[PDB]
Amino acid sequence: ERHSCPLGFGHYSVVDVCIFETVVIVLLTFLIIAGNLTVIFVFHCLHHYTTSYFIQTMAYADLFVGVSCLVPTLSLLHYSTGVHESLTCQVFGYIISVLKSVSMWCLACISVDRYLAITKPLSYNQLVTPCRLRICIILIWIYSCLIFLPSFFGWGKPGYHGDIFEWCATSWLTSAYFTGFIVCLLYAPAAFVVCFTYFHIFKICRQHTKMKKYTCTVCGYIYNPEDGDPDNGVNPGTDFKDIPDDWVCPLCGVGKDQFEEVEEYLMVLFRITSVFYMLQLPYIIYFLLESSRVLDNPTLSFLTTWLAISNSFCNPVIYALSDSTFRLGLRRLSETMCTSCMEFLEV
Template sequence: MNSSLVGNQSGRPFCLLAISYLETINFCLLEVVIIVFLMVLIISGNIIVIFVFHCAPLLNHHTTSYFIQTMAYADLLVGVSCLVPSLSLLHYPIVLSESLVCQIFGYVVSVLKSVSMASLACISIDRYIAITKPLTYNTLVTPWRLRICILTIWLYSCLVFLPSFHWGKPGYHGDVFQWCANSWNTDPYFTLFIVVMLYAPAAFIVCFTYFNIFRICQQHTKEINERRVRFSSQDGEAGEAQPCPDKRYAMVLFRITSVFYILWLPYIIYFLLESSNVYSNRVASFLTTWLAISNSFCNCVIYSLSNSVFQKGLKRLSGAICASCARQRVAKDSSTSRSKRSSNGCHV
């Protein structure tokens, strides 16, 4: 490993996207631009989501807000952790060895994305219970149980990827490091372990719950419309079709879940192909990895565009910021006018 690092330092920098290397710049330009751009978007977007949730009490009425905030904090930490590969690509000196840094980075990002995936599965279960058992929902889903569930998600995610330090690479988050790309190989049995313990159960839960949610909502909508038409015909008034009230909120969560799996599907497919020695390509590794990581920004965009209560909270937050800025300007102007008056008085 040391010899490869020495050779890398004396020659061209290690770049997964070879087209990004320029002779006049001694670092991987395109990789740095992509990672820094995603890092800024992820951090700024999720900070806004977290602040809006704290400033809009109506958003906290839904129990799913617990899981959405958990996803926002996990995605925010993903954006902060992207600083590590950025410094590596810029050849910033790191105290720890490259092998340990890339292993820790790969483990941390894998855990954080596992938290997001498990949170999406828990959100779908929560909505399924709310629709199938509305009368006993408040007794089944309590804040204390939600906190226990969130703690379990974090512990389970940490334990699932813990064997990666000795068993094999959990993913391609650390492939911007030369040691991770060349010396840290994937193990097909560990890949199967991750699929069985995380990917497959989460995907099955999401598909099962949302399929039944939309089926039940469709039945409820049909029954409500039939009753409305029957009563309106007796009263001589035209009845209008009313959608299921839970379906609109379920659609928001379904969009978030769908985008999550759409962005992660290329990464999972490549992960399976490379671990089974069917296909391996560094460019595909980099692109699929950071396409999956970009989901950390897409969550807040979808939620802000789809949820009306979130939009009101965002407007309230922006209004509060503008009001504070206006107050600061007024205070600054008044202080400058006072200083001018005092200076004029001294002159006299």
């Protein structure tokens, strides 16, 4: 299967061809499959519930991005089936664009859900239900498929996700009509949805100055400033900063040094949202310029394409690494291996 391998410009040879492209794809295919499979076995096999479902969905969306990315890696690894390249780069580029819309929308629905919880706190549970959230999921899956369905009916190229394959990078051409359609009906709406919700959510929060929770890095005790530690002289309504240095963890006795601020779940979702929408921003700028024929650059086409695909890997990393309990799981894991390493070494 022939590939478009523009990196290492003019330095490639019969043994060196498609090496920088192959490391990027093979790493991302691995990091996205592994990174989401860990998240769905730890948290998706008990938070704010509606968001827990949008996050669960975009976990399977991001996993199947990397599962699809097994196609380029195996073609780049000289494994082939007796099927035209024009077809496998047409199907893959469709599947990825759709999955990329499913995750992009999932982050737009979380943003609205958190908007509605904060703006209509009386009505929130009366607007959101287990049937409404379930019909909202399938409408993302239907809408995403239908914005990238024209590619199968001669409207043009819906992205550069298959431009690693030769046929898609030189034979299929993006049409400004099709690109404008996608941008206006998918990229522009989600971007404005998440810009309006997170602007107003932080507009409201900036007035209401809530006191920060802190967790014990050793055992996982949460100092909740609304409760305090009344047994040990700590009045409720005292921030962690105000407790004297003398104070110690009630569950294990470690000092105020061993306590990290518990990050707010909204702020985690704003980070996942800003990383995701910023990692595919270069790719939409290139997608607009090339469709407008103001620019053609296969290297800029490849970097922005895989910089976007990489946000299927950042999603599970921001989510698990912003959570205090997952982190503790890893520190207890290292110790389990260490004490067993001290033990297996007793010989």
